[model samples]
Target: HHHALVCPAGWTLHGQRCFYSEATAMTWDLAEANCVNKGGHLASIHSLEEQLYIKDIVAGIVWIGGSACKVAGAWSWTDGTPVDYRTWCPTKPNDILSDCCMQMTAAVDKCWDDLPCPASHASICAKAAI
Candidate 1:
């Protein structure tokens, strides 16, 4: 079956969503605010394909909407989506420190790591344009 691309102007179509990478360095909260202003949330990765897709688009590291700041060890997306899919690096979401924000690290495979929300990083914004 053929599929139609329904993303908004200047955004890339992926799966059923539209994704935009913001290269401007900023804290997770600020990045989220930017995404919100752009009519989207900080991208909440829902599948492996989406994760790899984002990996291919980012430089260095990028922030996503996942976090465990509310209650350590309990991760959730900032948009209130279910945290059913995760690709965390080995021993990640490090409980040793207050790293709450989820990041696509600069690792070879661009797996996930938790970082302090105040840490500055680029971001990927996603929204349903359908």
Candidate 2:
């Protein structure tokens, strides 16, 4: 089934939603806002299994909607909600000292990593998968 969040011709929809996968190089805030402006939000990973799926979809890297803006070490997913789900990569550290945003890279099989908020990368948007 196709949805407004599906990836466009040039892009592949890794998660439930997204506009242009080309946005593989935008800051976390920008990425989140990008999705918001598109009626979406920074991608929220609800399951670790989904991370594996993301691994298969993207050949490069991107960012998701999550940060420690509320706390130095406390990180949460998009929707600005608590991290109810977990897909923490091995040794995945939320270096609150320097990193404030989250980045998903080709590393560890598209597994996500954290970094400073100033970093940039494309992003994915989440929509109901059902």
Candidate 3:
């Protein structure tokens, strides 16, 4: 009943998933596309522990997998999962009118922020361990 999670070379193994943070900075869509091209999506954090695992590895503004562009105020992860957990900055996700994508802000708190999709940032990609 015991199993070990293994990640590909250059990836970090956390829980049951493998995370990869890209050094190259790019737009949200571009970062997401890069993840997809590598057979994963932007990291979808589900718990505080998971967030902590990602925090240090990902510094500065970085794109995550969630977005509300399709339906304003209704966010979902790129892997098609419901966003049951959240860590938005105080008074954030405030730009319901235009901000559509999700990213970890550069603030010291490093909380999530709703940003316009076109905005550029580095990104972290994730996928389940096989």
Steric clashes per prediction:
0, 7, 0
The per-model lDDT (C-alpha) reads 0.87, 0.65, 0.87
Expressed as tens digits, the lDDT of each residue in 1-130 for candidate 2 is 5535544444446555443343457777877877777666776666766666665555577787667777776877767656876655678865566777777766766666778777767677654432
Pairwise lDDT winner, candidates 2 and 3? 3
Candidate 3, residue 16: lDDT:
86
Compute each candidate's TM-score over C-alphas. 0.91, 0.73, 0.93
Q: For residues 1-130, what per-residue lDDT tens digits would candidate 3 score against the true structure?
A: 3777688987898878999999888888898999999989999989888878889898788999988886778888998866878999999887584888999899866799999888878999999775
What lDDT tens digits, residue by residue, belong to model 1 across residues 1-130? 3567688787898877899999999999999999999999999988898888888888889999887787787888877788889898998869534778899998968899998889989999999866
Ranking under lDDT, best-scoring first? 3, 1, 2
Worst 10 residues of 2 by lDDT: 14-23
Task: Check candidate 3 and list the clashing pairs.
Answer: none
TM-score of 2: 0.73
- RMSD of each predicted structure: 2.2, 3.9, 1.5
TM-score winner: 3
Off by over 4 Å in 3: none
